[PDB]
């Protein structure tokens, strides 16, 4: 079953976060999919010291609670920091690394001690095969005997690889699709086709669809009801009705092979 | 006077510290330098769980103090995490920001209500004219007036930008030099002469040869007695002779302008 993680870009209030997860109910129902519902409880590192943050670990987590019970979702967030990682986890089935953080061994072994799906974004810096290494980092913490990150064995311990794209110049991210299938040697992996496209969104879909034809695990997408009114990337985020669209097709294209 | 930030990139021991310490004592008392001692506690990003971490915030902090008493040495050391600022600013003059934290809201606002000054090192990753919102947020927690970030003002308030190149393809790094022009206008700049080399130590003394000909109000480079045997960055790091090289010809350059 492929995976669709897909929600807000951050927890803007609760009546949001239910009107969001009311209106992707028809997708989390999808029985082709494994779906996850996103929403980030800080934005850490945004232009100004006045831009929207969220509500911060406590309240964030709560509402993400509220969420999982009344809809019966399952919940993906980001971690920033160290000691966000058990108490996060009691909430969120996966626990997602940020790109700038992808070789920081602390983070890493801190979320990969709790029982969350460990889903490591890769840094739009790195080689591709040079995310092996973040994912033994995991899997060692996992099972002590792992020598080597395999597909098969990140599978079965939970730990996942996120593309997000690559530094092409200055304000510029490429995908290289090459990435898809380098990384899926070493674990799942999962195409974020929000955070991909800057060039110095129409993209996304595009790219979703050439991703899904490579070969992928999943789709990471952010999508908000009324995007224009939102207080986070919402430039980048798809209507439920485009998000929808998209996997329809990953879903067509994924029937092929 | 042009500042020259030198050290291991790793406490070792208390025995190393002192050894480099030692050889870097001609340096330190160089009229035309205003000079920093550069030691990490804490190696973050390593490739592996065994790779060696460092004494850690506590037990280097206590080291690189008992270096500023013997050797009558001012002190520089990045931070990772928030809550490390206070304490560490209390023995380091100096704290730096690594790269892939450069964004990192609450790290810069922690850091800048020090009394330290600020290195804030441009991400691999970064458009340098994007690093002004990085200066801004520095200069705002010191001073609430102050709306765009300019040299004058962030040499007032002690926040540097530090140059460490930039992602060309995978396993490399090219140092465009007009970020060190563009970077200037927001504030000092400093240049990192041993971690902007990547390609798929030798070129350290050509690029910061180059550096000083454009322009800049310092050098950081790692240095070590017998990189051979190093804990860290061995590869990359110079002998204190080479170090001294790099410096008078830096020294030589600047006279002219």
Same mark, same amino acid.
């Given at each position: 079953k492929?995976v669709?993680?897909?929600?807000?870009? *951050?927890?803007?209030?609760?009546?949001?976060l239910?009107?969001?997860?009311?209106? %992707?109910?028809?997708?989390?129902?999808?029985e082709?999919?494994?779906?996850?519902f996103?929403?980030? &409880?800080?934005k850490?590192?945004?232009?100004?010291?006045e831009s929207?943050?969220?509500?911060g670990?406590e309240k964030?987590?709560?509402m993400?609670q509220?969420?999982?019970?009344? &809809?019966?979702?399952?919940?993906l967030?980001?971690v920033?920091?160290?000691?966000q990682? !058990?108490?996060?986890?009691k909430?969120?089935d996966?626990?997602? $690394?940020?790109?700038? @953080?992808?070789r /920081?061994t602390d983070? $890493?072994?801190?979320? #990969?001690?709790?029982?969350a799906?460990?889903? $490591?974004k890769k840094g739009?810096?790195?080689?591709?095969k040079d995310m092996?290494? #973040?994912?033994?980092?995991? %899997?060692?913490?996992?099972?002590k005997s792992i /020598? #080597?990150?395999?597909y098969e064995?990140a599978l079965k311990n939970?730990?996942?690889?996120?593309?997000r794209?690559? !530094?092409?110049?200055?304000?510029?991210?490429?995908?290289?699709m090459r990435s %898809?299938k380098? +990384?899926?040697?070493?674990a799942? *992996?999962i195409?974020?086709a929000t955070?991909?496209?800057?060039?110095?969104? !129409?993209?996304?879909?595009? @790219?979703?669809?050439?991703?899904?034809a490579?070969?992928?695990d999943?789709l990471?997408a952010?999508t908000? *009801?009324?995007?224009?009114?939102?207080?986070?990337?919402?430039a980048? +985020?798809?209507?439920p009705?485009?998000?929808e669209? %998209? *996997?329809?097709?990953?879903?067509?294209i994924?029937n092929?092979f």
């Amino acid at each position: 079953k492929s995976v669709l993680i897909a929600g807000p870009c *951050v927890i803007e209030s609760l009546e949001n976060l239910r009107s969001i997860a009311t209106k %992707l109910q028809p997708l989390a129902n999808n029985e082709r999919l494994d779906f996850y519902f996103k929403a980030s &409880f800080d934005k850490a590192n945004r232009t100004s010291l006045e831009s929207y943050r969220g509500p911060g670990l406590e309240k964030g987590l709560e509402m993400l609670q509220t969420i999982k019970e009344e &809809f019966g979702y399952k919940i993906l967030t980001d971690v920033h920091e160290s000691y966000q990682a !058990s108490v996060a986890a009691k909430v969120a089935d996966i626990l997602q $690394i940020p790109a700038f @953080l992808c070789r /920081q061994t602390d983070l $890493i072994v801190e979320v #990969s001690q709790t029982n969350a799906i460990v889903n $490591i974004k890769k840094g739009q810096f790195m080689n591709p095969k040079d995310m092996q290494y #973040s994912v033994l980092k995991a %899997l060692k913490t996992r099972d002590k005997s792992i /020598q #080597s990150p395999t597909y098969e064995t990140a599978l079965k311990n939970g730990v996942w690889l996120c593309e997000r794209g690559s !530094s092409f110049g200055y304000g510029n991210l490429v995908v290289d699709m090459r990435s %898809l299938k380098i +990384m899926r040697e070493f674990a799942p *992996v999962i195409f974020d086709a929000t955070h991909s496209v800057q060039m110095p969104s !129409s993209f996304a879909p595009i @790219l979703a669809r050439a991703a899904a034809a490579v070969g992928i695990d999943g789709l990471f997408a952010e999508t908000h *009801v009324d995007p224009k009114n939102a207080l986070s990337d919402g430039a980048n +985020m798809l209507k439920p009705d485009e998000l929808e669209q %998209l *996997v329809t097709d990953m879903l067509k294209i994924q029937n092929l092979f």
